[model samples]
Target chain A: RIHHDVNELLSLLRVHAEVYIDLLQKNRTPYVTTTVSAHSAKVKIAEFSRTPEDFLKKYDELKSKNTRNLDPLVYLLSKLTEDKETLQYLQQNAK
Target chain B: RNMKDFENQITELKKENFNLKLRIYFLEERMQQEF
Candidate 1:
């Protein structure tokens, strides 16, 4: 993507190849840093928090709103949260 | 004010457009890594 060389004297090709993928995520925040934790899960049984709701909203928009909800709330949260973990996992294992 | 600036900008946009492609690729890679 480096169309223009950083310097005209040299034809530099900019690369975002993600080779050092982990380095980029060194200080990034966890994608699932929750303001609320599972200790409150009992009180909020069957409750859909903002994260789960937003995930569902985006999913529905992508497909269909009427699409049956898949994999109970807990499973959905686990997978959704896994996505967030992927970022850190890359930062760790991929490093 | 000069052709050089426009040429340079065009070149930059070319990279920008290419970067957009990379962004798409990154998302795809992220998805595949899961499986």
Candidate 2:
């Protein structure tokens, strides 16, 4: 049975995440690269246990435990994008 | 100027115009989504 209060929160994190990180890297390497060319700037971020690709690959990792069934993975991503400092950092660093 | 340079300028102008429209579209989309 599903509740009427279905949390259909369409997160814009995907859009912002892709642009934000790409711009961040471009900011740091603008002269070295051209933002005009996506091929020149296709970056894979995060060297730790999880790369940025891991975020998408590990969606199952974020399924909500509560009836809310919120995926912890999504929760973590939401948190990352929510950080004001991180947001500003990407904006500032983007060329 | 060479045809390539002229063509490039035209393409650049088109891109700029497209970007301007995209900005407006983004604004409008946000308005619709929010309101």
Candidate 3:
């Protein structure tokens, strides 16, 4: 029974390990999008371009707005987004 | 009296829980990358 479950876990690891590592190496962070209409203007995606203080404050507000704990993955992603070094890396490298 | 049988099952269950925790941590890591 344990072997069967372990095998299943190994399969999940094999499937997700590479994709996760690829994003980490590149700092290609993802964001939760608020949907804009399909008719919204087309534009190139780019960095936030906010000042450090401003960006941090914005993230703080977002965190405050969430009364309940976030999911584990959302929590980690937000942690990365809140970090200055990781944030900088993402700004430059994320596509 | 088959005492060894219950002991073996308990040991295997402990092993399964440990492995399951290990799997969860990795899976959690993977999940955030999708975010």
Candidate 4:
């Protein structure tokens, strides 16, 4: 039961991330769109061991870039990564 | 010109981002309750 719940949570998080990435791409917001495009690909292929950390790393990179209109993406990444239980469970148990 | 286009895009993006944030908040709250 716990496993199923956690999996759903992670799946939702990824879906949200993908939607935000699509929005950025569609808008073509100068410097921001390109960064997310690359980051999106990385997130898609990364293992559970590298997951939320990968999200956070991209968050930091986006923060440093200081580009406009990234608050949603940054906020999404931070919120998803903040859930320690879900992330830890995935790291240890997910394939 | 191009400036107007950028400004409009920014506004639209902001609105979408705000909506996404709300959805995330609700999901997070629900997860906490379940687990």
DockQ leader: 2
Task: Provide the lDDT at A80 for model 4.
Answer: 60
In angstroms, the error of model 4 at A38 is 53
Query: Once superposed on the true structure, which residue ranges of model 3 sit more than 4 Å away at CA?
Result: A1-95
Q: Rank candidates by lDDT, best first.
A: 4, 3, 1, 2
> Candidate 3, residue A15: CA error in Å?
24
CAPRI tier for the interface of model 3? incorrect
lDDT of 3 by residue, A36-89 (tens): 332111111113444546754654576577544423324344334454754454
- Let me know the DockQ for model 2: 0.05
**Model 3: lDDT of residue A81:** 40
DockQ, all models: 0.03, 0.05, 0.05, 0.03
lDDT of 3 by residue, B1-35 (tens): 59877777765666666556556667776889989
The runs of at least 3 residues in candidate 2 whose Cα sits more than 4 Å from the true structure, single-residue gaps closed, are A1-61, A64-95, B26-35
Cα RMSD to native, each candidate?
Answer: 17.6, 15.4, 16.0, 17.1
Candidate 1 scores a chain A TM-score of 0.22
Error of 2 at A79 (Å): 20
Candidate 2 per-residue lDDT, tens place, A1-95, comes to 01101111112322232222222242244335222322212232232334566654554354333434243323344335343655564674565
lDDT of 4 by residue, B1-35 (tens): 77878777866776676455656766887899999
